[PDB]
Amino acid sequence: AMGSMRLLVSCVDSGSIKEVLCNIGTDTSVQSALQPFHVAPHLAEGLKAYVDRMWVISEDEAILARNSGVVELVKISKHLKENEALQVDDDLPKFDISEFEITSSVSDLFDDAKLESLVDGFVTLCPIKNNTFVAATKSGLLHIIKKGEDKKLIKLASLGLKAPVEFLQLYDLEKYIFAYGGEENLIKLVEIDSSFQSLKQIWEAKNVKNDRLDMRVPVWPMALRFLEPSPGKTEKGKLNYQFAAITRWSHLTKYSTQHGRKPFAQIDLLPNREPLSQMEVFDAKGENVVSSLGNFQSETFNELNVITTDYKKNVFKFDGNGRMLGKVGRDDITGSSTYIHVHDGKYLLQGGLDRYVRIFDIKTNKMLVKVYVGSRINFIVMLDDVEIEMP
């Protein structure tokens, strides 16, 4: 029934990826708990070039976007870990570990100067959906990159967008459509034409009205997830996209395009515009309620819950009304939680400045995995392809 899981972890400090094999109940900080079966680093390219985003294509292949400005295609191989003898002068179970080789890459994908009008990095590396990929930047580039018939990467296109970009979420709940936004850069919907040779802007949000002291409410959306389209009777001459976003001034803002370009709610999640980043849909019983790009598979905001993080040490759960549901890992997380991801509905992947990779059960809120990796963490994928061979 219970076979070890396989984590790949972006290790910022040494610009590398670690594979970690471990069961549930693993805690490196408690010597009597299960320890990991295996932990090794791979592909260390240094701090200058740390991994910004990963995507795993399959057991055999993944694609990496790095802060050197470089997207790499990575072949993953497996072999059984041989169980060797300690003292030298038998046949027991074995597990799959990985070897990672870069087969091909693409370069010079940042524009540092385009930001001076602070420094570039990737904020999306998604499939467009199946061998074509989006890799977008803060400088406001949207590169389209394909795995060619020859198995090498080629750049189909580099489309301009308004800088700076915090995120670039593709719509995939039913035309290539995506949202994007950033500091003082209003959420825009964009249609890219199926040849990938151009894009058109189709929607731009409007700011909310001024506040009680008649002062402008600043704009900084940080992350966004689509809901399904508004049900029933709809105006012609207007789009029908629904989406919610978290801002860097502690907003949960909700949008329908049917309603209009202003959000129909911009709720303050926390006091004093406490800065936030990231946004993960989840259902409180651990149900998988999202598309493969994390968009919420529902047509009302009412059933929406999100997980976001502040820049201190906390990981907050909120409902679609801004009502706090609780913190995750309040006793264990001591550093800014740089990466969270809800995996298959029921697990929260977490890692940040405190150098521990963690896995929480969304439903019980229990810590299932704690593994110290000695490095700040900015990404994790969980795999569940472990082979066990018995003798």
From Swiss-Prot:
Asked whether the UniProt record includes Hydrolase among its keywords, one would answer no
Chief site of localization? nucleus
Residue runs in coiled coils: none
Task: Enumerate the UniProt keywords alphabetically.
Answer: Nucleus, Ribosome biogenesis, rRNA processing
Give the GO biological process terms: ribosomal large subunit biogenesis; rRNA processing
- One cellular component term from this protein's GO annotations in UniProt: nucleolus
Where does this polypeptide localize? Nucleus, Nucleolus
Residues annotated as signal peptide: none
Task: Relate the assembly described in the record.
Answer: Component of the pre-66S ribosomal particle. Interacts with NOP7, RRP1 and RRP5.
What does the sequence similarity comment in the record state about its family? Belongs to the NSA1 family.
Give the misc comment.
Present with 2740 molecules/cell in log phase SD medium.
Question: What does this chain do?
Answer: Involved in the biogenesis of the 60S ribosomal subunit.
Could you tell me what this protein is called? Ribosome biogenesis protein NSA1
